[PDB]
C-alpha cells in the first residue's frame, strides 16, 4: 500500500481559476494559462512517479515475498530488466 | 514481412524531461522541492 | 520439491515412461515424442519442468502452427529494434522466455525446412540469432518435442535436414495410442467426473450408468485425454445431470435437434 | 600464436594429416573452403580455423545459409536502416557488412537462389563501400569460410551452383575422412567421449567396453561421422547400468523402440 | 588503369575496340565468361574516358532490395511512408554523366528490365510523389556471360533491352581462344603469389608442365589461372617447385 | 513543325490522319514496333494540337509501387495521409491541360488499370483526401509494341476499359514493310554521325551495302536505323573508302 | 434528362426502373458490357428523394494502401496529434443520398465483408468520427458484369451478395434491339460534327448502314460511339454521304 | 417479447427459444449456431431485447472486422468499455485477425504480457468451425472455452412447415411498408415455387425474393401466381 499521507497531493487554486477566465486583461489570463499547464504538468508527473512506484512496488513485493517473508537468507536475484519484463514495468523511467 | 510503405510518434524534451528528472529525486527531496515551487504559484493550493 | 499434478496414467508401460522422464529429470537434453493425438503429451513436458523444479520459468510452452508466415516462429528468435518496421521496443520474446529453461516443440513437424535449420544452428552453440544487425547471445537453456509425426518417414521425405533429427536424438517418448488405453481410461473416466463436480461445484457427482461407461468406450475417444475433457464438460453442460447419474455425453457439438 | 585445442577430436589416419595441411593453408587470408558429410566434423572444423583465425582479432562470422527466411534476407545481406525498409533506425549494416576483416564462415546449405549467392559473391569479390546508402554495400575485407555437404562438380552438371561462383569458390578445397573413412580413433575417441560422459554424469567409474560391443562399434554403418558416434555414446551414457558390466547392448539406434 | 595484361591480339583488337570508343558515351555491352576481366576493362574505358575525371562506380544488377528498385536508380526525396529523412536521391540519380557498370545484368528482374526500360528513355528521372522529372546523362555500359541472342529466343530480357544495347559488345576470347602468354601470365601471377606467398622465387619453375596447362580446360581466364596457379604453389610452397606434377584439381580427390 | 523522319505515302496518310485527329480530344493509342519514335509524332500533333501550349506527360509505365495515383498520377497534394503530411505534386493533377502519353501501358498491373479506367471515362479522380474529383483537360495518349489485340484477348487488358481508351487507333506501318525511305534514312544518318564523330566526310556505302539494307531484314527498323547507324559509327574507318560493309550482327562475334 | 436509345423492353424495363426509384430499397444494378447505364442511376436519384439529396459516388476499384481511411471513416490521426482534421468518411460524405458504387465486381473481398457491415446501418466509428450511422442514404451499387457464379468460383462472399440487393437491375442485349441505330447514330453523329465544327451531316450509304447493321454490339453503347467517331474521321468530308463503315481500327492497309 | 418477428412456428424454434430463454437469465459468456442473413444474429436480436439486465447496455455489436492497430485500439481503449457490464457480441468469427482473436480469448479470461469487464458475452459463427480447427485457423483453447452450451438454428430447408407463416408474416409487413392495399393472394404456383424455393439462405433469401415478387406483383387487387426470383442481373 502507497504511502498515500506520506504521499502529497497538488491542489490548484480554484478561485484563481475562477478569476482568470473572466479577466478582461489577456497578459492575466495568459499568466494564469501557463502557471495552470505547468501545475498540471506538476501534479501528473507526481501522480505517475507514484503509479510508477505502486505497480513496480508490487511485482517487487510479489518478487520479494520470499525476501519479505523468510527474509534476506531467502532474498532472491531481483533486477530491474528482469522486474521490468515480469511486470512490464517502464524500460526507462523505471530505471 | 517484406518492404514497401506503410508504417508510422515522439515524446518530449527539456520541459517534460525536467519535470519527469524532478520524480527520481527522493520522496523528501520532492516534498521540499513542491514547497518551494508552490512558493511561487498564484493558482495552486 | 515442487510436485507436478496428478496424471492418470495407469499404463504399466506409462508407468515405466514416468520412470525413464525421472531418469532423465536430473539429466538436461533434447526429450522428443511419438505425440500421440488426443493424448495430453505436454502435461507430462510439464511434469518434466516440474521434475526438474528450476526456480524462475523454464517450462515454455508454444507450438508451431500459429507461427504460419515464416516471420513468426522466426521471431521466437525475434527482432531487437527497427528490422523491418518496429511496431515496438525490443521485438524480441519468447527466446528468453526460457532465460535458463527449456523449448517445448509442438507443432514442430509443421515448421518450415528453412525455420528447422535455423533452430538447429541456435541448437549446439547457442548463438542469438537476431533480425537486424547485432551480436548474438546464448542462454544455458534446453528444449522438449513431442509430436506423432513419424521420425524416420520425415528423414526419408527430408523435410527437416538430418543433422538436426539426430541432434534432437536424446530422449524419445512413444505415448501410447487412446485406444491402446482401456482401463486407464476408465480410470480418468471417474477422476474427469469428480474433478468437474469439483470444479463446477454441482451439488452431487450424477454418477454414471455402467451403460454409460461402456458407451463412452463404444465412442470412437479418438483422443483418450483430450476428447475426455470435451466429454467430461459436455455432460457437465446438461442442466440437473449432476442431481441423477446420466448416460448424455455431447459427443459432437454440431448434434443438434 | 598457438591455442590449445578445446577439442581435439581428430583421426591419426589422416585428419591427422588433414590438420596439418589445414595449418599449412592457415597464415593466409584467401579463399577458405572445406568439404564433409553430414554432421562430419565440419563445424569441428570450423572451430579449427577460428583458432586458426591467426594472431587476434579473429571476428568469427556465421553465415547459417538456410536461414534468412524469405524476404529481409537481403538486407542481411547488404544493410538494413536509413529510412528505407518500412522502419527506420541506425545503420544495422548486412551481416557480411557488420562484420570487417571477420571469418566468413559458409554454412553448406547451397542456396536454391543461384542470383542472391551471385550478389554475396560480387560483395565477396571485392566491396567498394556504398556511399550512396546502406541498402547497398561497403568497403569491408574478411576472412572468408566454406565447406562442402554435396556433390560440386554433379551440382555443377546438375546447374545447381553457377560455375562463376563454383570458380570463385572452392580456390583450395578441404575434403574430410568420412565415418566411412576416418575411422581412426573409432575406440579412442569412443572413450573420450565416454570419459566425457562420465565426468558429465559426474559419474563413479567407467564400466568399460564390451567385446560384443566394440565388434558393434567397428560394424557400425555410422551413418553421422562425428556427432552420431557421440550420439550414441550419450545413448549408451544415458542408457547406463551396473559398474558390474563394462557395456550393454548397442545404442547406435536408439531411434528403435525400448525393449 | 590497366592489369596484367593477357597480351593477346585479340586482346590487341579488343583494346582497340575500346580505344575507339574511349570518347562515346554509348550504351555498351559484353558476353565475358568469369575470368574474362571484361569488368576491368570496363573499368579501364571508364577512367580512360572522355570523362576522365568522372564519377565511375557500377552497381551490381542482383544488388536491387525487393521493393527499392524505383528507390534503385532513383533516391527517396519526400513522404514514401518513412515519414522521415527519405531526402537522399538514387546513385544513379548521382551519376550524371558517369559511369555504373551494369554488371549481372544477365539476371535482373523483367520487372527491373522494364523500369531500365524507362531508364533507357532519354532523360526524365523520376522520384517518389514527384513534381518535375530529371533528364540526367548519364554514362550507360554492361557486360553479360550468356548470349543476347539465346535470352532473345528464350525471350529471357525484353527486346527493349536489345533496344538498350547500344554500343558493339566487345566478347574475351575463350580460355583455349586466348592461349595468348599462358607462360607469360602465369610468370606474372606467380611473381605476385610468390609476393603473397612471401617464398623468395620458384627455384623448381619448369615449363612442361606449362604445356600440360596449355592442355587445360582453364574455364576462368583470370578466375582459374591465378586460382590454380596459386593452389599448386600453396601445395608446395617451396622453393625448388617446379612445373611437374602440379595439378589443378581442388574439387577432384588429391592422393 | 518537328523534324519527321520519313516521307512515305503510308507515313503521309498517317500524317494526314494525324491533321485530322488533332481536334479530337478523346483518348486513342498508337501501335508500332520497338524503337517506332512514334511518341515523337504524338508530341508534334500534341504541340499541333488544341494544347499549342500544355502539360507534357512522359509516364513510364513500370513506374509506381504499391502506390495509387494520388501517390503516382493524382498525387498527394492533399497531404494528411497515413504516414507523415506534406505537399505531394501530382501527375494526372499536373497534367491536366496538357499531353500525357503513356508509355507502354502493355505491361502494367491490373490494378493499374483498374484505376485508370474511372480516371478516364468520367475524367473525374479525386486524390489522397480530397472533396472533389473535377476534371483534367490533358491529351490522354498511350502506345505499345504489343498488341493487344490478342492481349486483351489473353485477358491482358480489360478489353472493356481498353477499348474504351481508345476512340480510333492508328498504326504506323512498319519499316521493312516500307523499305523506302532507305536511302534518305542513311544519308541523314551519315551526316548526322559524321557531325558527331566529328568526322570529315561521309565515305558513302558501296552498292553493295545498299544491297545489304535490301536484305536488311531489319527487325528494329528506326530501332534497327539507329543501330545501322552505330554499325557505320563504328565502321567509320576512312571517309575517302566508302563504307564497305555495313551490316553489324553484332550478336554475330566476329573473327 | 439524357440522351439514350430505348427499345420496347427497354422503356418497360425504364418504367419498373421509375418505380422502384423513388423506393429507397438498395437494388443490384447490372448492365451491358458497353452499357454504362449509371446515367440511370441518375435518373433514379433524381426520380428518388434525393432529386436535392447527396449523389457521391466511388468505383470499387481505386483504393490506396492496405485499408483506406477515406473508404469508410477516417482523417488526420495516424499519430502525434491525433486530430479529425478530415473526419469525413465515405458514408459521412455521402450521408443522406446516392450512396454510389461502381467497380463493385473488382476489390479485395475482405472489402466486401468490411462493406457488408457498414452496408448494415454503418456503425463506422473512425478516430476521425465515431457515429452508429443507421442514416438510409440512398445505397446502390454498379460494375456488375460477375455472375452468382463467382461465388460458385468464391471471388467474393455469396452472402454478402445476397443481403446486397432484394431486386433486379436488366441490361437488354445492344445486338438483340438494334432499333435506334441509325437513330442514335444520326444522334452522335451530329454532337461530333458540332464537336468537330463540322459542316454538317453529309448523310450516309443505306448499305453501309446494313452492312453496319451486321455486328455483335460487343460494346453496346460505347461501340456505337467509337465506330460512330471513326466512321465520321474516315469520311473526312461532309461532301458525299458516308458510304463507309469502319469496322475496327484493329485493321490494316 | 419485441415483436415475434421470425416468430418460428416449427416447434424445435420453440425448443431453441426455450433454451435460449435459459442461457438469457445466465450471465455466462454464450454462443449460437445458425447462418447469417438465413436469419443474421435475429437471437441476438431477442437476447438483446430478453435482456434480464434490461437496462444492460447490450451495444454488444461485433460482427465485423476492423483494422489493425484499430483491434489494438479497441481491446485497448471499446471491447468490454463498448458494452460495460453489458452483453458482448460476436460474428464472422471466422473473420478475426490471428492477433486479433488471441486478444479476444485472452480477454475472456486472462492473457499474457509483460483482465476484462462486462458479463454475458454473446457468439455466433457462419462457418464449420471444427474445419477451421483441421485448417488450424485459431485458437482452438478459445474454441473449447467458448463452447460451454450453444444455441443452434434450423436450416432453411429444415425451417419447412412455418414457411407459409412466415411469407404471411413477410407480406404483412411490407404491404404495410408498400403502402400495398392488401396482400393480393396465396397461389399455388407460388406456393410450389416456395417448396422448390432452396432458399440457400433462409431470412434474407426469403425475404429478398418476397420483395423482388411484390414489386413485380404490384397489384394488391391481382394475386401472384409464380412470381420468378432475382435480386439482380441484365437483360
Ligand atoms: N492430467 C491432465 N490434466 C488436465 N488436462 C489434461 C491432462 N492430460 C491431458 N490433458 C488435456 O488434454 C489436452 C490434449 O492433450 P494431448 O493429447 O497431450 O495433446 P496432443 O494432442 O498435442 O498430444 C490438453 O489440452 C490437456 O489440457
Ligand atoms: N572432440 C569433440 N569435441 C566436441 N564435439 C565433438 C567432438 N567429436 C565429435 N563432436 C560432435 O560431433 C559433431 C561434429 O559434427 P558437426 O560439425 O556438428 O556436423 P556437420 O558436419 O553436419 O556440420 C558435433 O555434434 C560435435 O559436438
Ligand atoms: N588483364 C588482366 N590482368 C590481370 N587480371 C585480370 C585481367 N583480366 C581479368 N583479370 C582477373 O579476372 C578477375 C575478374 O573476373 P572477371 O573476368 O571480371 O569475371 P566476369 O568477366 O565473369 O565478370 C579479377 O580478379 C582479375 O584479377
Ligand atoms: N519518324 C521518325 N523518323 C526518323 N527516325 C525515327 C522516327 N521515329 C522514330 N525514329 C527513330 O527510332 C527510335 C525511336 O524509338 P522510340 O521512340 O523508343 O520508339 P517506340 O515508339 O517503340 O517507343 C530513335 O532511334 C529515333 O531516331
Ligand atoms: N441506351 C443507351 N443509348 C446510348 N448510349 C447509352 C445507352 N445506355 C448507356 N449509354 C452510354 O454508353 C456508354 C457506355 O460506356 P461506359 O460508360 O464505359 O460503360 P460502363 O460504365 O458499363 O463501363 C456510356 O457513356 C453510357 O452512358
Ligand atoms: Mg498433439
Ligand atoms: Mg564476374
Ligand atoms: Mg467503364
Avoid at chain 3, 525490443?90 to 513437424?109: C, I, K, M, S
Amino acid at each position: 500500500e502507497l504511502n498515500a499521507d506520506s504521499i502529497p497531493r497538488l491542489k490548484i487554486n480554484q478561485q484563481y481559476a475562477a478569476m482568470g477566465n473572466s479577466a478582461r486583461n489577456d497578459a492575466d489570463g495568459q499568466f494564469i494559462r501557463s502557471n495552470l499547464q505547468e501545475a498540471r504538468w506538476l501534479i501528473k508527473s507526481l501522480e505517475s512517479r507514484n503509479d510508477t512506484l505502486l505497480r513496480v512496488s508490487r511485482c517487487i513485493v510479489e518478487q520479494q515475498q520470499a525476501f519479505f517473508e523468510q527474509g534476506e537468507e531467502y532474498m532472491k536475484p531481483m533486477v530491474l530488466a528482469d522486474i521490468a519484463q515480469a511486470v512490464e514495468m517502464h524500460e526507462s523511467t523505471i530505471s | 514481412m517484406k518492404q514497401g510503405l506503410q508504417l508510422r510518434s515522439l515524446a518530449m524534451t527539456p520541459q517534460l524531461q525536467q519535470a519527469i528528472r524532478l520524480l527520481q529525486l527522493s520522496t523528501l527531496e520532492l516534498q521540499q522541492e513542491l514547497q518551494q515551487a508552490l512558493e511561487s504559484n498564484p493558482l495552486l493550493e | 520439491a515442487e510436485y507436478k499434478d496428478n496424471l492418470l496414467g495407469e499404463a504399466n508401460s506409462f508407468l515405466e515412461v514416468l520412470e525413464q522422464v525421472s531418469h532423465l529429470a536430473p539429466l538436461d537434453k533434447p526429450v522428443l515424442i511419438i505425440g500421440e493425438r488426443g493424448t495430453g503429451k505436454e502435461l507430462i513436458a510439464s511434469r518434466l519442468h516440474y521434475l526438474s523444479s528450476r526456480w524462475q520459468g523454464p517450462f515454455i510452452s508454444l507450438n508451431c502452427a500459429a507461427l504460419n508466415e515464416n516471420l513468426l516462429d522466426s521471431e521466437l528468435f525475434g527482432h531487437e529494434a527497427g528490422a523491418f518496421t518496429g511496431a515496438q521496443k525490443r521485438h524480441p520474446g519468447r527466446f528468453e522466455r526460457a532465460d535458463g529453461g527449456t523449448l517445448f516443440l509442438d507443432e514442430l513437424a509443421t515448421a518450415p525446412m528453412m525455420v528447422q535449420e535455423k533452430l538447429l544452428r541456435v541448437i549446439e552453440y547457442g548463438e542469438l540469432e537476431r533480425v537486424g544487425g547485432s551480436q548474438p547471445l546464448q542462454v544455458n537453456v534446453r528444449l522438449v518435442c513431442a509430436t506423432n509425426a513419424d521420425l524416420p518417414a520425415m528423414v526419408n521425405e527430408g523435410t527437416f535436414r538430418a543433422d538436426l533429427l539426430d541432434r534432437l536424438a536424446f530422449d524419445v517418448v512413444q505415448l501410447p495410442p487412446l485406444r491402446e488405453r482401456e482401463s486407464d481410461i476408465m480410470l480418468m473416466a471417474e477422476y474427469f467426473a469428480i474433478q468437474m463436480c469439483r470444479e463446477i461445484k454441482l451439488p452431487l457427482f450424477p454418477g454414471f450408468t455402467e451403460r454409460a461407461r461402456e458407451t463412452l468406450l463404444n465412442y470412437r475417444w479418438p483422443g483418450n485425454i483430450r476428447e475426455l475433457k470435451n466429454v467430461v464438460e459436455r455432460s457437465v453442460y446438461r442442466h440437473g445431470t449432476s442431481d441423477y447419474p446420466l448416460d448424455d455425453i455431447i459427443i459432437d457439438p454440431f448434434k443438434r435437434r
